[PDB]
Design a protein around this ligand. Sequence first.
Ligand SMILES: *P(=O)(O)OCC(C)(C)[C@H](O)C(=O)NCCC(=O)NCCS
Length: 89
Amino acid sequence: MQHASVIAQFVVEEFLPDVAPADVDVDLDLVDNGVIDSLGLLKVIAWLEDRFGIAADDVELSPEHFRSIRSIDAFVVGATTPPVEAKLQ
Ligand SMILES: *P(=O)(O)OCC(C)(C)[C@H](O)C(=O)NCCC(=O)NCCS
């Protein structure tokens, strides 16, 4: 897990940026925020894939992928771990 704090900040900042993301239990299943799994996922995959040019086929989309931030961290780290100071819309 590299820059794991950025991953929580990346997802948490999108939902609650007025709250310190490092002060949020990053152990919460993003499923509650599943709102991003469909509407945000379409925008994130289209924008995120374009930014790194990663084909969606490389990874399958499913609710289990958002079950926990740690699970996603492994898939992202296994392919690419891009650290960012803040989430870009
Ligand atoms: P949302 O809560 O409608 O997304 C829920 C899940 C993740 C179950 C979604 O239906 C799914 O099967 N996975 C992602 C599908 C997808 O490509 N989303 C973009 C347009 S819905």
